[PDB]
Amino acid sequence: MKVFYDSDTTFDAVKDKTIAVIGYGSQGRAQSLNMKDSGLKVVVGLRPNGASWNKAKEDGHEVLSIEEAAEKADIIHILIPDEIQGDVYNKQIKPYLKEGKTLSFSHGYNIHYGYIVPPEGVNVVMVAPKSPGAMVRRTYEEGFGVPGLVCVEKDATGDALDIALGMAKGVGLTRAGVIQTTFREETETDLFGEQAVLCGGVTELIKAGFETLVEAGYSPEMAYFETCHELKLIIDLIYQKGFAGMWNDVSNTAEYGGLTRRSRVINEQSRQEMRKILKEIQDGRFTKEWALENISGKAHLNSMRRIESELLIEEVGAKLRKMCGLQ
Amino acid sequence: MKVFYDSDTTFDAVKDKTIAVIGYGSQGRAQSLNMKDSGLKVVVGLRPNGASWNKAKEDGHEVLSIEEAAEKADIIHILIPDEIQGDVYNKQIKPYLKEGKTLSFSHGYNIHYGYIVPPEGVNVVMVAPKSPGAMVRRTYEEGFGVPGLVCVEKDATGDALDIALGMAKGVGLTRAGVIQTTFREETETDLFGEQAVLCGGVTELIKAGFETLVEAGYSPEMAYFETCHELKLIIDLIYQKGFAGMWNDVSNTAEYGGLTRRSRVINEQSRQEMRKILKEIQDGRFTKEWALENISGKAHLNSMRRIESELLIEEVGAKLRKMCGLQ
Amino acid sequence: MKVFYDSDTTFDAVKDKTIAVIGYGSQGRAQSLNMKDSGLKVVVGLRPNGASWNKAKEDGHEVLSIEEAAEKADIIHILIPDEIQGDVYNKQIKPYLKEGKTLSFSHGYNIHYGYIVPPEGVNVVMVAPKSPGAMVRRTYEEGFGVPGLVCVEKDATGDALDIALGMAKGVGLTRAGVIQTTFREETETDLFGEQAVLCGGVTELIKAGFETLVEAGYSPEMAYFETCHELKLIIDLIYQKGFAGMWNDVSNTAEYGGLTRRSRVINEQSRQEMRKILKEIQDGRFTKEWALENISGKAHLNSMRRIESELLIEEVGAKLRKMCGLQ
Amino acid sequence: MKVFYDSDTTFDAVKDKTIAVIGYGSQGRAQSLNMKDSGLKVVVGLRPNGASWNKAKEDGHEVLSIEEAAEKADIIHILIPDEIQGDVYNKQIKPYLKEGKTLSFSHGYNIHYGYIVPPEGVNVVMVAPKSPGAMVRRTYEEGFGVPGLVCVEKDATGDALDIALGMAKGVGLTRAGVIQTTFREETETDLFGEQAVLCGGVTELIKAGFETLVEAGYSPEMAYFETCHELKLIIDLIYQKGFAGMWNDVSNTAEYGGLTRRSRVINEQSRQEMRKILKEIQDGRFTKEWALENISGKAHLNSMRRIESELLIEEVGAKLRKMCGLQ
Amino acid sequence: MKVFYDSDTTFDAVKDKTIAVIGYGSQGRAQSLNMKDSGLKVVVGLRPNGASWNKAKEDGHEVLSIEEAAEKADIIHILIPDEIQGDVYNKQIKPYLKEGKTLSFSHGYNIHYGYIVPPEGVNVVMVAPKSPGAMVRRTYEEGFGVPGLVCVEKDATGDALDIALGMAKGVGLTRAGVIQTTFREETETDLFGEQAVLCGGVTELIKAGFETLVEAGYSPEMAYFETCHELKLIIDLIYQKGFAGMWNDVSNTAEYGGLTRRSRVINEQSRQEMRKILKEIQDGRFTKEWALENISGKAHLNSMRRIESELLIEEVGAKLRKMCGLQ
Ligand SMILES: [Cl-]
Ligand SMILES: [Cl-]
Ligand SMILES: [Cl-]
Ligand SMILES: [Cl-]
Ligand SMILES: [Cl-]
Ligand SMILES: [Cl-]
Ligand SMILES: [Cl-]
Ligand SMILES: [Cl-]
Ligand SMILES: [Cl-]
Ligand SMILES: [Cl-]
Ligand SMILES: [Cl-]
Ligand SMILES: [Cl-]
Ligand SMILES: [Cl-]
Ligand SMILES: [Cl-]
Ligand SMILES: [Cl-]
User: By the 8 A CB rule, do E204 and D202 touch?
Assistant: First the structure.
């Protein structure tokens, strides 16, 4: 689509403005340091009774309380988990807002589903890198950056897009290219990807192939190699050269085998269920389910975690990664 | 069934009693004004920090706080949304109750599902008009009223039915006729009607017919007319003259067409699902689901709302209603 | 689509022309009186041995025989039931036609399905109000009118559209807005609407909900209220404010209930059968079936009528409408 | 498996230690009195504003507040309903814990699903009798006891198992035999048993047989006898002599009938659903559902209760039990 | 239904009459001793070449041969297994019958299915206790009795009902209450109960739950506890307090779990098969099958017995009952 680069953006809208980064996780740290290193005026609002409070001080940030940071700053960038953003916002951020300020996120989940409703006269933007905090910071240290996303949900003051592009210019996303999408599009495609393919899809795929080999009498070690370990090789090829580049870089036996058997693994039933997974995200049923999970104490989620940790594929991968020196 | 009219009821049980109407929505306003205009002693309990507080004052009501009204009155009529009645009751009403008082509703949802448990020695009645507040008030201004429902859930003091009929006599329902049913029967049939036919049923019916025409290449404007706009004509005929009166008032081509094709639209599957919808209401699963919807932040409900507002039938109806001068 | 209003139309093509309205039903009477009252020269052709003959005289119309009217007039407007139009046309209208005359209808059923084939040099137009005769006349008495449809099936003389818009200008449809569609589009969408939703669809929906409650032990009176009587309230809201306006004007419990249960009542099977109902209308199978119904003596239709009149919902609605004073 | 008896256990680990029994239900009372009567130092922590507070005093226990008891004791035995343990623990128990103390339960539901997370340095054990409080106390009064379960979830201090066996020795379970299992195994099999067979399974079985007879025209009284009342006879035989002992103690006609028809009642579908019921317990979905039931006000649960009380089998059993003198 | 008690019955019809009890099983012994102890004149007819012959003598009964007893007595009470009653009757009882005598049973299986056809002028009655012989005798020793059933199949002489009530008065059933049903109703409901629920139903239920746990890796000992051993607790509660009393006496987690999962174990397929099991009893197909089982040497029945004794649930229950001291 339309891309913004360095030549296409300036720091005019962020120049004389104080930016509060709420949160010091991987994205909290990487984005805060980059913008500070880009010349932007940054304060980091955290909980006094927290671990990241002391780490953010070790890095030389003006560390404040979340209320203290919300009050001082014109731009509040919220990088905390979606499942507690709403509660932290309505208690410790919303009261310290005023006409002219800007609300910024790296994820549109809370805005899109109504868990955070901004006050009148407040901009709502998104500055979303498409790489983990570690890479965000690392590429920025090297004079390059990582591809990112930018969005405008509410343009109260008029320079919402420029504020978001200014923040993206300071984080370094602009060096690699920034794409303008919508809060709804970022949210829905992000939830669908993680659920249907990125996290859910592939782990069930790897489980099924591994369990097929193991139940057929094949060595668990060999099964882990051909259904899990080796997969990184193929993805890296697709990541760099695309599908056609991958097929050319693998053996013709592997190419023919993949092209003739793959429609049998992802059947029509899988595709019909992918449509329901998307509709459950669209109409808010998944958000409801995820919210009630936290409200009910995450018992379902913690049981699944224990079951996942008891998998044979886990125990075999640990031994193999131990031998390799990967783990 | 058995009907109560004006000749069948008196104000003996409500005469020297103070009635608190909690809430000033369509029913809050219409019912409060009618009873006051009928000679009954009315106070209106509201939130001081609310909009209806000032409107209720503009109409000349003794406006009080919900606690203030609960304390003063012998009869507390609660006309606020079911999904917050329980919380408002257990905090600001229950403490100001005493033996001899009466708890009154226009909807039995909260009593029936245990979200409001009355104290010992307190009457639980229902005064439920079967028309919207606007009509309730309007018909009463004209010397007539609107058909209503009356119920007794707990007869602590002995004049529970008379208190409810006295309130119905002051609201004006008695002029058109009042029917005595049960809190469970009002609740279950109300939930089933709105879900299976009144709101859910017909909108899905209108959507399907409209989407059938549009997907077949028919003009969206013409599709809106023959699947939505015209429907009011038929309902008004059924409302006034019943089914047989409607069929006689439409063309024989429309009559034959309707009588021979309609069993094909509401199939056996629709009727089997109507039975499950009823059982989900009966056994409290819907109430649980609706309660968790509010507890989880109404994300599912707000997503559905946005999707409903993005429908083609909405955009076409707006243009047609704009031309007509209806909207 | 494109709308014609008063400022967009004139009486130039109907000015010095005699218009015969064949039929004095609800539309016959309303349309004839309006055009006469608008200044147009109207004669009403009827059967001498008929009831409407004397009523049309009481209203001051030049009442003629159908042949007499067909001969005198340049424009013949046929407002009699579709199932006898063809026979009345080929015997008492077609012979008195000449090049330059215009054939006009409010319904394109007979033209579209070949039951009326016009002679060469004769215009075929449609002047179709989208409201019942009573409203057509009433709104016209009040300086406003009712939304209508206009169509040109054959433009022999050149002013077919102007003749139809002139008639629509005299009936008063032009004050509310007139839409130009086709004889096929009016016919097919009209038949589909009445069959799938307007008459067939909703009555089967109301039957199923009512029969569900009654078979579950609920009071027939209460079942009629929540599956029939109350429905008028919702439709009137959709009629005036559309879907979104209705949902906002009902309780959140009714809104959530409707949005989550309605897809279960109109299932995929209902939508597949709606497509067949449309194809049966498109390819003329329904017209064949309706024609053979009349030819065979309407035994099937009269049996269905008797069965409809024996329904429990009829007997309960009559008692409730009797109490209300509606019937 | 491996059983612990009296000869296998001592009071060494509980000797100079104060044991707080939180709760005075059937198990609270029976277990507290037994351990006190066995020589152990017991205090009973309860709510001051509660009924059991006064009953526990009538029995001569040192009655304390839950916080008071948590502070004084080294061993805190929590015998309150699982659905409020977590809230009572995190507020009134967790703060008064210290390294060296022990957390004890008769049910592992809250520990296993993460609703109670113990502090570092605190033992987590289970002392679970396999009989109701009434029998626990009664058998102990008679020099015998009731079979029990023992578990160690966290062995911080080293004598966790001995502390649990010491408590089991004081409750009297050791006289009948104590089995060491795991918190997960006790929880999952307990939930599965109550749901699939012990409470859910058999009541649906009794309902189906009773409803089969009644719908076939058989006397409800006779149906209750042959589908409910008589069942106690068979269970008591299985309880004492096992399956083979039961079959030998019934008529050959009843034996042949049971052995040839029973596979037809519990079909493959029942067994497939038993596997899903177990997986829903394993992965925490049932715990989530039960938690949300309480959070949402137990509307679903209270509706089911009312429906259960309206069953014909209830009304007929009451009359028969009334005649018998059982009720 | 209608109950007979002590105040409602006398010994007038049995006073000067000799009662032969054929058989000295649990019911043979208990019923014979009770009637003798009640003042009735009893002789016990048995096989000379049998074990019970000597036991019946040890108890002080006038012990006779079956023919000797049939000849002496006016009332012949047959308490031997249904599958040999017919052969013993037609050879050693029928010839010693005369007009005026009475044929009595505790089970109507043989009369109802035509295996015993009485001679003209002979009464056919039923005296059926609803408890095992051990309890019949024990309760009678304690001044109370056990609930019973009474039936009249043929009233030849006129005092058939009185003879049966007199026998029930001597057995002691009248102290607890006696119900009058029919030979067909006792038989069919007895066969259905034992097959669908009492013996067949519950053992297959217990097998499925136990096998579910065991196949999932749960300890067989723990599986026996939660699918078999504990069940006695629930039944005893239903036996004494009914369903509602049981649910109130179990944990809310067990109650919610049971009410929401139980419809999944007894599915529609189970209920359809219960109807076939009943029809097979009604139309005599089961009786035919049971008769051919004995005629063919009980090979099928003895194989099933061996298979039942080889079950894992048997071996685990034996070890657990051994530890408990139950077995
Ligand atoms: Cl760094
Ligand atoms: Cl190649
Ligand atoms: Cl699909
Ligand atoms: Cl007013
Ligand atoms: Cl007709
Ligand atoms: Cl069904
Ligand atoms: Cl007029
Ligand atoms: Cl809202
Ligand atoms: Cl199709
Ligand atoms: Cl005691
Ligand atoms: Cl045998
Ligand atoms: Cl399976
Ligand atoms: Cl004895
Ligand atoms: Cl409760
Ligand atoms: Cl069937």
Answer: no
Taken in order D86, D89, D90, D94, is the CA torsion positive or negative?
negative
E42 C-alpha to ligand 13 centroid (Å): 15
Are the Cβ atoms of E265 and D301 closer than 8 angstroms?
A: no
Q: Check CB contact of B292 with chain A, cutoff 8 Å.
A: yes
The first and second tokens of residue D135, run together, are: 């029998």
Q: Across the interface, do D193 and E313 touch by the CB < 8 Å criterion?
A: no
Sign of the dihedral defined by the CA atoms of residues B95, B97, B103, B106, in that order: negative
- The continuous run of DSSP H or E covering A77 comes out as strand A75-78
Angle, vertex CA E128, rays to CA E126 and CA E130, nearest 5: 160
CB contact set of A181 (below 8 Å; sequence gap of 6+): A1, A149, A150, A151
Residue E177, Cβ density class (10 Å: 0-12 exposed, 13-18 middle, ≥19 buried)? buried
Using the Cβ of D319 and the Cβ atoms of chain E, whether some distance falls under 8 Å is answered with no
Contact D303 B287 (CB under 8 A): yes
Single-letter residue type at D219? S
Q: Answer whether D299 sits within 8 Å of B287, measured CB to CB.
A: yes
> DSSP letters along A143-171, please?
T----EEEEEEE-SSS-HHHHHHHHHHHH
The coordinates were experimentally obtained by X-ray
Q: Point out residues after which chain D has a gap (C–N over 2.5 Å).
A: none
Residue B15's region, left for phi above 0, alpha for psi from -120 to 50, else beta, is: alpha
Contact E238, E213 (CB under 8 A): no
CA-wise closest residue to A292 among E260, D292, D85, B304? D292
Nearest-Cα distance to chain D for B24, in Å, is: 27
Question: Could you tell me if A165 and A178 are in contact, meaning their C-beta atoms sit under 8 angstroms apart?
Answer: yes
Assess whether A107 carries a catalytic annotation: yes
A106 C-alpha to center of ligand 1: Å?
20
First to last CA, chain D: 40
- Bridge partner residues of C45 (DSSP): C22, C64
- Partners of residue B292 in chain D, C-beta under 8 Å: 292, 295-296
Which residues on E lie below 8 Å from D242 (Cβ)? 314, 317-318, 321, 327
List C residues 69-128 in contact with B (Cβ-Cβ < 8 A): 81-83, 109
**Is D327 in contact with E241 (Cβ distance < 8 A)?**
yes
CA of B141 from ligand 4 middle (Å) equals 8
And the tokens for A80? Answer: 């905390």
Burial of C29-68, coded b for 16+ CB within 10 Å and e otherwise, reads bbbbbbbbebebbbbbbbeeeeebbebbeeeebbbbebeb
Beta bridge partners of B128: B149
CB within 8 Å of A145: residues ≥ 6 apart: A136, A139, A171, A172, A173, A174, A175, A176
Inter-chain CB pairs, A–D, below 8 Å: 40
Nearest CA distance, B266 vs chain C (angstrom): 6
Work out the minimum CA distance from D271 to partner chain B, whole angstroms.
Answer: 24
Task: Tell me phi and psi for residue C231, to 5 degrees.
Answer: -55, -40
Cβ atoms B53, B46 nearer than 8 A: yes
**Strand A123-129 and strand A102-105: pairing?**
parallel
φ/ψ (deg, to 5) at B122: -120, 130
List all residues 6 or more positions away from A256 whose beta carbon is below 8 Å from its beta carbon: none
Distances (CA, A) of A183 to A23, A125, A133, A180, D148: 20, 8, 20, 10, 57
Strands (E), D185-260: none
Could you say which of A297, A298, A300 has the minimum Cβ distance to residue D285? A300
Q: What count of other Cβ atoms lies within 10 Å of the Cβ of residue E309?
A: 13
- CB distance B223–C262 less than 8 Å? no
Report the candidate in C248, A118, A287 with the shortest Cα–Cα distance to residue B303: A287
Cβ-in-10-Å burial (0-12, 13-18, 19+) of D143 comes to exposed
